[PDB]
């Protein structure tokens, strides 16, 4: 039976609480890229580069209902993810 | 409710059918290393950089039973994932 193997970036992750989106970096790195779209309509609501930075986070509480797409860059690898504001 | 939010490259894939493990890049990056160790032991099972390259396919038919981890490492990301060979 086939299986797909799930791959996630060890340093990178990410989580939501009370619509404050919070990405960590594990090691610092010199440059990340953050941009959160709305799925929906493709706004992009924040785009940012980071520099040594542990902790970001975004307060979507504003923002449109529904759901959003985080990108987080890394020399050359395009991280993503999903998640919904509610 | 807190939520964790997973986070995946978009350009990378893996999978692994009848113990052949294949990883797919879907943007032929200048250099990546693909690393694979024994989850139990620690053996270093399979280990090289490539170069232009979209599929790799490693024949796990003769190893160890048991978990193994991938180690997929770009620029500075580190990608992993863990599978099963049965």
């Given at each position: 039976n086939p299986m797909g193997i799930p791959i996630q970036p060890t340093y990178e992750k990410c989580a939501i609480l009370s619509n404050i989106l919070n990405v960590s970096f594990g090691?610092?790195?010199?440059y990340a890229i953050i941009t959160v779209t709305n799925?929906?309509?493709?706004?992009?609501?924040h785009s940012k580069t980071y520099h040594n930075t542990s902790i970001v986070m975004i307060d979507m509480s504003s923002c449109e209902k529904g759901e959003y797409t985080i990108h987080i860059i890394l020399n050359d690898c395009l991280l993503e993810g999903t998640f919904t504001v509610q």
């Open positions: 090691r610092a790195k010199d799925k929906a309509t493709g706004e992009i609501v």
